[model samples]
Target chain A: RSHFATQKDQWQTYTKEKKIKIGFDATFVPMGYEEKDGSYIGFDIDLANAVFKLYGIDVEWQAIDWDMKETELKNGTIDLIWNGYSVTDERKQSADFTEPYMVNEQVLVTKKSSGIDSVAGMAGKTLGAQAGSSGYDAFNASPKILKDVVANQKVVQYSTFTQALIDLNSGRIDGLLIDRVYANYYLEKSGVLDQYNVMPAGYEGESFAVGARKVDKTLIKKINQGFETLYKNGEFQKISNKWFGEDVATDQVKGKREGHHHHH
Target chain B: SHFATQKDQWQTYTKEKKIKIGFDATFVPMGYEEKDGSYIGFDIDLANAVFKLYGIDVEWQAIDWDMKETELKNGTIDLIWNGYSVTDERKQSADFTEPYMVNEQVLVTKKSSGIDSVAGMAGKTLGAQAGSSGYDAFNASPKILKDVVANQKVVQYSTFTQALIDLNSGRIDGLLIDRVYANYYLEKSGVLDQYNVMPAGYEGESFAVGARKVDKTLIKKINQGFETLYKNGEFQKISNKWFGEDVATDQVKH
Candidate 1:
């Protein structure tokens, strides 16, 4: 029997209880983060609410250590890992993913005054990234791009992108490897977007998806269907536009040319 | 146990070496027959790319739209790869992959028809493609149709193209159809300027591949293939070939 076949019945029983536990890292901005009033607000928060509304399932949000997200899911500490959780092969071993719901790119950010404008310009410059992030993993990938360019050929680890940005601004690091989504949101919100230059790296494009235990294929299917429902009803785009000011819900490859070819 | 046989199909998919894909050759911009009698369109391209990943040969079958489910159940077709819309009613008979494109039902009328908006269709005749979601939605919602048009005032046509002809000839006050169909047909006929498109208040739908409920493993494989194609940029290339934009669901690359 298929893993999901048996899961379907289990999920029905689980949903009847009317509440799901979702884990997140509250520091991940524009995805799941804290507001001044201690209220949790962000793109994923709104999306989770909308998705569960379809199944009449309510959410219990829990903040967890970013590195232990997979462990939490495996140990049943949370029903889902639902922040801006990037799907990667390492995490896939322990979890089954919902269809990716958002497109993201890993990019290099630098101070405009530092005169670093492109990937080639980063040679011999110090770079920083949040520990345990996809950005960090990409830098360490074989045939390293960011690591190969930096002075020490190594990335200075930070606890958060915010701290990395602060270091980059103070010249503690020449560049910061981060997600374009987060960098753009943080910079624009801090009102200092004009002071920085964002450049794409050789790292592959990534997307955010809901993560569940490997045994929970039924839950994955339900979430995938829920996302499609939200999208069709215009609720997905509504929340996306509220946070990102555009429809970022669908996968669109960045920097790809449109109408470059005409087919018959 | 219900899916045991289908799980074997997935394991032997590459060994068997062939997959049959069913489509409506008349569904433009999705899957359709060209003037040259060759089958091509967005769904065809996507299906080809997905099966290609596993070294599988795809046999494209031009199927009667209404008998699609019957064909799948009887094994005359292995999958439905056209612009098959997902709905609660259809879910009873088939399982679906994640939706790749968002489609909405819209009301199109000739500018001279005097139907300027959805509300303007009050007491007027409306036409829809037979067995289409647009028709289903119209009939399902008494509030939408009863307040605007009489139930008997609604008409059904064999195709949106046929509906378009009657619409342009002023035979119907409005035509409710898929936006994908209406947009492609109107633009191709060079009469887009003569039509006013109005939102029909029918909730939008998403399109996905359809397979037997027991063929869950095949669906999973197809989804993985789709994501791989999406991650490597092949899916976008094919999407751009047909829709001129990447219409595949957003996928995250590790």
Candidate 2:
């Protein structure tokens, strides 16, 4: 079949250049975000670029939202969702993901004075979360919070999380549930620290992966192999330290070395 | 002006006896006795606002935290307005208003530390607020918990602030405290990057105001007033003033 021939040629090219186009949500600061000059930078960009160096592949970066990530991969608009893309049971249903490159746990943030001190206290209160992330799923599964048809409470969807945080600061919403890492970074850098408390309760923690189309099985395998090579040679650690201030790349290679327990 | 100390004091009192409630003396910023004998805190100010809606005046009182639940039960106080955790067992004993605040347990450690996962704390000591849910969660697991041998211990502190101080002094690798209190202290103490909260599997407890069994009416009123104040943006204003952002509402969908 033409598809099979193309796959073989693509594999050969992957082996040669070792570079793949990586896509991310560039507005996700500390992970991947465009600066004022419109140049993209963040931990995800740095990490992926470092991996490209390990594989000796040409690099291309694209910015897209979570909604179009899967379609982008299928249509060849981008190679993968590299921005803090969490591996959920749902995502696993349709797409293939490389070995987890990182981990991000969900966190809850609230205005400091709304008297909301616990999950039990959150009953009937409004909650804000990103539209297409696992945070939205967690809130949807929780029965204690009332469902607002307009994405009101459990899944107060927003095009940008900055808007969600604004609602949080302005008291339009009670809590802003988001990835813990972003919450920390946003709290530290966003300059509106006085308005919210970032709570440490996590609804879930999923390993982040380079998401690819399910049919792109060979490409997924190549990326996973590339990840392993970078991981072993300390390249991953170096990139991790440079970006995240720690060597989170070890999370993938650590326990998987000896047992090789689960399949990729 | 009689304090709401006894059933008789409450029973005999009309709407005119609007009295101030008492909380712990040393629990600063949330509830405490300021140096000038005046009371000011996020919670105290919130209670004041709640009372203001009813056109009532509140006098402030500070007492030891050790006997607060007993004081409320015995009618020695109208309510315990400290940052009191409202566990199921406590709810069985006393009526608690709808929680005015929420906090979760978190592992706090120095920023330079490599302790992202529990495995990273293989040989390190951990500290927790004595008798807190954080302490319970820390000591609950064996394999998931680090430094769990009998001699390798979990140090318990009488006060969270003391534990935090000890953590700063390098006495412990991490101190477990409620995230709300940690946020206040971490910034106020200028040790923001000095520590980071552990990222996984730590659970938290809820906090609420405490009312005596006989003060069900008061509890109901307080809760209603809270809901009203919260819906109206008064709570958001106070929260924004104290915590810098509104930490009160939930925007999650179910």
Candidate 3:
């Protein structure tokens, strides 16, 4: 039997109380960020709360090093990688993902005063992106766009978007490549949004999803169902609107229905 | 002259830093008076947040709900930020913010009444609050009023809570109300299990902030503030606090 099938079968008869431990990187603002008061809050935090509420399960949020997220999930340190965890093929090798709930795009942010008005203008100009971020990964992938810019100039790596943004503002880098969601909110909160220009780049879109161990199809199924219920009842939109000002939840249920029809 | 007056109104609210919001104080979960006589609800919270972004002080005016438009026109109130529904009639008098919420008129009956669907409401004496979208919808849809129910019997109640009181006492078979109000009140009353909410046949209603057409800048600022709140999660926090779920519409900008 398939691992998923076997897990589903086990869940059919399982009757033990369980608590879901959600692992997150605390600084991924508006996704999973820490407040100044030391309390954990973010878009992902509210989403997890709403989704798990439907299943009558309590969530224990565990803050983990961003790089160790997958390893921590595999070792049972957490039941879920529920931060603004990107759904990438590399990670999918070890983890199963819930239906993607949000779409993220990598974009270029430059000070309007820098006159790097477009991606074409990045020629020989320094750029910065958070290390290990999807934007950074996209830049280093095959047929890299940033490499041409880096070949002549340089690419700086930062541990967080905040540091990269500070560098951009201080003119240490000509531009910062970052997620559109993070860039907009951070710049808006910084109260100097008018000084920055955010331009869309050629990077492909990415999605955010909750991740579970590859073998835990039963939990994955439950999480998927919980997400569907939350969406249908408008709870998902509420949380999304709270965090992103838009309903960013992928309409996976509708997509699946259409796909099922196509299969027949 | 008209343009100059409009510019002054905008400056008064944005630069001079004060605006008055008129609302119905009894409209629960939108803008209403609390038992402590303190004003609260969805719109109150939202309005306060939006104006705070402009650094403008908001003067809450508890006005006769029916006179909201008149108050806006006469400068007695600068804006209407109650659970003001966007309908063709209101559009003639005021400019609206892009709708932030979608509220459907729904029929609520005790579960024991066996009215499981809108069709089940046939042969029932239905009730609706006077001057509500729910009442307007029932009267507008002939298929629902004439064909669905027996004798076309419809009773008008002054308030939704009053209608609910009558519903529980078996005086009325059903109550048509805004889903936002019904959900918040019924859930809080701990009587949700005792009732079933049936979706009304009419297309749902939308809600927006109302400013005189001349004060277009004020509306623009409000819309900007609303989008900021919605995007940053502040709107969701306020919504969840009031309705325990997001009742805000996602199609505000799109």
Highest-scoring model, TM-score: 1
Ranking of all predicted structures according to lDDT, beginning with the best and ending with the worst: 1, 3, 2
Instruction: State the TM-score of the second chain for every model.
Output: 0.64, 0.68, 0.75
Higher-DockQ candidate of 1 and 2: 1
**Two-way TM-score contest, 1 vs 3, winner:** 1
Model 1 lDDT vs. the true structure? Answer: 0.75
Q: Over the stretch B1-254, how does candidate 3's per-residue lDDT look in tens digits?
A: 45443443887677768888898776666777877999988888888998898899899999977688888888888888877767788889888888888777778999999888888877877887643666667767868754667557466554566678778977578888877877777766777667888677778867888888888778888888888988889998888777655777875430
- Give lDDT tens digits, candidate 2, residues A25-106: 7777788889999999987787777666665777788877768787777666676678888655467665777776666666
- Candidate 1's residue-wise lDDT over B119-235, tens digit each? 888888788764466766886785776467844546665456657766776657799887667666666566677888776887776778888898878988988988898889988
Candidate lDDT scores, in order, read 0.75, 0.65, 0.75
TM-score of chain A of each: 0.63, 0.61, 0.65
- Please write out the lDDT profile of model 2 over residues B181-251, one tens digit for every residue: 66666666666556676532554545678777666667777777777788888888777666544667352
TM-score of each: 0.44, 0.39, 0.42
Pairs that collide, model 3: A242-B233, A244-B231, A245-B230, A245-B231, B25-B32
Off by over 4 Å in 3: A1-264, B1-4, B8-12, B64-76, B86-93, B111-116, B122-136, B150-152, B155-162, B165-173
Could you tell which candidate, 1 or 3, scores higher by lDDT?
1
- Model 2's CAPRI class is incorrect
Query: Each prediction's DockQ?
Result: 0.02, 0.01, 0.01
